[PDB]
Amino acid sequence: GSNTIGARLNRVEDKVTQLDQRLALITDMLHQLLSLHG
Amino acid sequence: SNTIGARLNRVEDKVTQLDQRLALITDMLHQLLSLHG
Amino acid sequence: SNTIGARLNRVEDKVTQLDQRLALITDMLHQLLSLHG
Amino acid sequence: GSNTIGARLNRVEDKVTQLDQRLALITDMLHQLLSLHG
Numbered sequence: 776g777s778n779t780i781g782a783r784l785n786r787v788e789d790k791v792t793q794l795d796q797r798l799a800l801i802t803d804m805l806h807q808l809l810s811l812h813g
Numbered sequence: 814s815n816t817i818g819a820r821l822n823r824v825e826d827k828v829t830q831l832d833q834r835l836a837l838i839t840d841m842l843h844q845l846l847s848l849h850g
Numbered sequence: 851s852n853t854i855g856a857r858l859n860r861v862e863d864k865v866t867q868l869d870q871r872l873a874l875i876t877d878m879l880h881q882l883l884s885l886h887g
Numbered sequence: 888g889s890n891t892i893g894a895r896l897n898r899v900e901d902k903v904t905q906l907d908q909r910l911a912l913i914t915d916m917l918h919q920l921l922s923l924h925g
């Protein structure tokens with residue numbers, strides 16, 4: 776629980792996973808931008 | 814400042830900052846996409 | 851798989867993956883900037 | 888040394904710092920792109 780080493784690492788891992796999903800979405804937006812230029 | 818608890822709270826803070834950056838980058842990309850049509 | 855060592859090696863691996871993504875995003879942005887002139 | 892909990896956390900913190908610097912550079916590139924469109 777919000778204090779514990781295991782809990783902190785759990786939050787960190789979840790957050791990093793969320794960063795990865797946002798970066799996949801950012802990459803997709805960039806693909807769209809590149810494709811719409813030709 | 815070199816304890817496990819101290820290191821972990823810096824890492825969590827920095828990862829949170831990274832998410833803030835990601836939200837701004839996402840907004841900028843929405844602006845760019847919409848500006849193109 | 852729930853040990854501190856196991857958690858930390860997943861976190862380090864994921865953070866490394868994030869850097870790979872960042873390098874690709876950077877390349878794409880260089881392409882876009884240069885395509886504009 | 889590459890094994891230790893403190894060492895692993897040191898690598899993780901350094902890497903996250905590097906991610907932050909890359910994301911600042913990405914943001915700058917996006918600012919340039921937006922500005923060159925008007």
Ligand code: NI
Nearest residue numbers: 812849886924
């Ligand atoms: Ni354009």
